[PDB]
């Protein structure tokens, strides 16, 4: 309906510019403040350092951005793999939930032009399981509220508010189980705050990855459960959103 | 059947530990290059200056580190959170693309994010549907002067439905990934090699960051800016498009 | 006591080019950052680039990439000054002074007058 | 390629007078230097990193300012301090000066 077409585009094009004027006011202060110390931290060795010209320690500054950008750490000089087995298989995960974290990049144009195949085949191989796992999970869901539900039927509540009730228990212990739980494993496991937990959790569920907060890349000695259990976790999540992102879908349309 | 998605589940599986054994390959043996190259930047720095330390670099090179995770460029206009990088990374979340080349750094940030998400992507997914219908009836409309032809050349209907899918995905991969990754060849100074890539992670909404285009606007070329938030949001019904039918395809198989 | 000595006044033809040059002594040369600055019959002064001394690096003002060539010899910690295809507009006095974010000495100054 | 501007260009004062000059620049700038000149002599720094004092400077002068404004100022004024004296910042390359303010004696 191109009437349709061209409001909701109007409107969607609205809801950019809303949230720009949000983040602007809420991230643009920090930002300045960063480039202020940034030069202040310039204009101080400059002058603790004569022997160095402005224009030679913008040079230094660009290169170290350069390999800090790659991934360097300012920290050492020279143990750890980001590409060991189970950080790769992570990787690969990345790609086909089309998370795409990215705290790790590929170096090598071979690296590069096999994760364009790997992709364009992993992802709907990927989306047919999620839509499979999506069926099955609602299934045992619907299935084990049946049993309550019986419950709420005898004490006389109408069946179209049992139903709605059900939803509400429904979603709450999926919440639950897949974005408090979650969020509270993250909280004492990666040593985030609560806020930062919920912010990864849903950042990841939604498949946005930014990467500034990635949990299961490595395992955790000591606690062996973990590292498998967040992936398990990833999967069940995001077939969990999938049915909820949809319906909030549902819900816009109908406004 | 759950007997059945058990099986999917292990080939999957086997999807990942075969792409692991491969990016493993591919790429642990370049693992370190970045320290190499900041230790190589320090070294050749404090051989050109004698008047600093190891040490006192390396807190230059911490305090550097420190400010540009904050979100500071090296100078030598280029604020991410001005009013058209503010627009673009909203973009980068309703679309679920999330390059992340820039970070929240604010509580507050983060909270909001949360909210603008939950309500933006459904509706962006909602508009382009939208737009992938309407894109759809154009590619298709056009493709039907063709189908004309090959219902002349008594070509069963059949096959001619199949050509025009082929035409349908091969004329827009022509207009959304061909033509943007020459594109950008020429305004990024990225190879072919680089553009692709970026197209492609860019439009499967992977969004790694590692290559960004449009995030801010060009002097002496001012249509590239939007034309590329426009590219974006075609591109993404045309990908969508595929990817729902090669997904129709699928699941009944 | 840091100090930076100049060569003499000089006087050359129109479209020549011109070399001149600023010992320093009281210091280490190779330690500090030199500088040129043009300054035009007493109005404003005019920074035309840096070199290094110890590294050869040099930047430029824009207005003089093209006019102006940086130089040192280290033995004899002196630094160079060329500027090329003279015109009368070149004509003015010109200082080397050291420094890296203020210019804290200065050389007395040299005179250029470009005419016939 | 920050700009400076000092204004007004000339001025004029008796020997007790209190005297400031004043340095706005086109962007934000995190230190002031100030040269004194007199007709005949290459400049000379004289006020650093925006109220330091050079060696040879007397006590009268200081600097003071932040962010878009800086001021010299000559608590009071001298038949010795008749001079012009530049404004320069050098927190973005390239460097760049004022025009000069020049100072000289009533009568």
């Known amino acids: 309906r191109s009437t349709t077409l061209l409001a909701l585009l109007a409107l969607v094009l609205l809801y950019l510019v809303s949230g720009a004027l949000v983040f602007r006011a809420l991230e643009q202060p920090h930002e300045q403040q960063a480039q202020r110390e940034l030069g202040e931290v310039r204009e101080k060795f400059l002058r603790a350092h004569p022997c160095v010209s402005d224009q030679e320690l913008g040079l230094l500054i660009k290169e170290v951005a350069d390999a800090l950008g790659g991934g360097a750490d300012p920290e050492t000089q020279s143990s750890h793999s980001a590409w060991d087995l189970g950080s790769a298989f992570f990787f690969s995960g990345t790609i086909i939930t089309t998370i795409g974290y990215g705290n790790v990049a590929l170096r090598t144009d071979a690296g590069r032009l096999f994760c364009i195949f790997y992709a364009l085949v992993g992802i709907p191989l990927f989306g047919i399981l999620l839509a499979g796992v999506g069926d099955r999970l609602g299934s045992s869901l619907r299935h084990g509220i049946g049993h309550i539900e019986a419950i709420f039927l005898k004490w006389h509540v109408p069946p179209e508010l049992v139903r709605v009730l059900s939803a509400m228990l429904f979603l709450l212990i999926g919440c639950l189980l897949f974005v408090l739980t979650p969020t509270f494993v993250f909280c004492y496991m990666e040593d985030w705050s609560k806020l930062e937990a919920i912010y990864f959790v849903i950042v990841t569920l939604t498949t946005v990855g930014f990467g500034d907060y990635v949990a299961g890349a490595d395992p955790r000695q000591d606690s062996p459960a973990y590292q498998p259990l967040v992936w398990f976790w990833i999967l069940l999540g995001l077939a969990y959103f999938a049915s909820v992102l949809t319906t909030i879908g549902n819900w816009l349309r109908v406004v | 059947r759950s007997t059945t998605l058990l099986a999917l589940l292990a080939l999957v599986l086997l999807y990942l530990v075969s792409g692991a054994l491969v990016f493993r390959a591919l790429e642990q043996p370049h693992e370190q290059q970045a320290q190499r190259e900041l230790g190589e930047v320090r070294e050749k720095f404090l051989r050109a200056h004698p008047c600093v330390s190891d040490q006192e670099l390396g807190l230059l090179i911490k305090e550097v580190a420190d400010a540009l995770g904050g979100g500071a460029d090296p100078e030598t206009s280029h604020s991410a959170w001005d009013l058209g990088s503010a627009f673009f990374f909203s973009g980068t979340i309703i679309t679920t693309i999330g390059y992340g080349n820039v970070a929240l750094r604010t509580d507050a940030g983060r909270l909001f994010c949360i909210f603008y998400a939950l309500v933006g992507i459904p509706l962006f997914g909602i508009l382009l549907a939208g737009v992938g219908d309407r894109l759809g009836s154009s590619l298709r409309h056009g493709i039907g002067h063709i189908e004309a032809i090959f219902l002349k050349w008594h070509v069963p209907p059949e096959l001619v439905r199949v050509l025009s899918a082929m035409l349908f995905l091969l004329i827009g991969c022509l207009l959304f990934v061909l033509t943007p990754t020459f594109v950008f060849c020429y305004m990024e100074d990225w190879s072919k090699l680089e553009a692709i890539y970026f197209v492609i992670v860019t439009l499967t909404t992977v969004g790694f960051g590692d290559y960004v285009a449009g995030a801010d606007p060009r002097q002496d070329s001012p249509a590239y800016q939007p034309l590329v938030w426009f590219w974006i949001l075609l591109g993404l019904a045309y990908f969508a498009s595929v990817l729902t039918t090669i997904g129709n395809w699928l699941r009944v198989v | 006591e840091v100090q930076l000595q100049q060569s003499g006044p000089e006087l050359v033809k129109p479209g020549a080019s011109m070399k001149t040059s600023c010992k320093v002594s009281?210091?280490?040369?190779?330690?500090?950052?030199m500088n040129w600055v043009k300054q035009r019959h007493g109005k404003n002064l005019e920074w035309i680039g840096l070199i290094n001394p110890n590294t050869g690096y040099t930047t430029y003002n824009q207005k003089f990439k093209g006019k102006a060539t940086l130089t040192v010899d280290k033995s004899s910690s002196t630094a160079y000054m060329e500027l090329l295809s003279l015109t009368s507009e070149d004509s003015a006095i010109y200082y080397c002074?050291?420094?890296?974010?203020?210019?804290?000495?200065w050389g007395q100054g040299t005179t250029l007058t470009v005419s016939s | 390629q920050i700009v400076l501007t000092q204004s007004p260009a000339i001025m004029s004062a008796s020997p007790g007078e209190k005297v400031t000059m004043t340095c706005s620049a086109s962007s934000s700038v995190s230190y002031m230097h100030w040269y004194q000149q007199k007709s005949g002599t290459s400049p000379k720094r004289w006020i650093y990193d925006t109220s330091k004092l050079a060696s040879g400077v007397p006590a009268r002068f200081s600097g003071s300012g932040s962010g878009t404004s800086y001021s010299l100022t000559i608590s009071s004024m001298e038949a010795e301090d008749a001079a012009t004296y530049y404004c320069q910042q050098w927190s973005n390359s390239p460097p760049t000066f004022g025009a000069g303010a020049k100072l000289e004696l009533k009568r």
């Open positions: 002074t050291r420094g890296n974010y203020v210019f804290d000495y």
């Open positions: 009281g210091y280490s040369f190779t330690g500090y950052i």
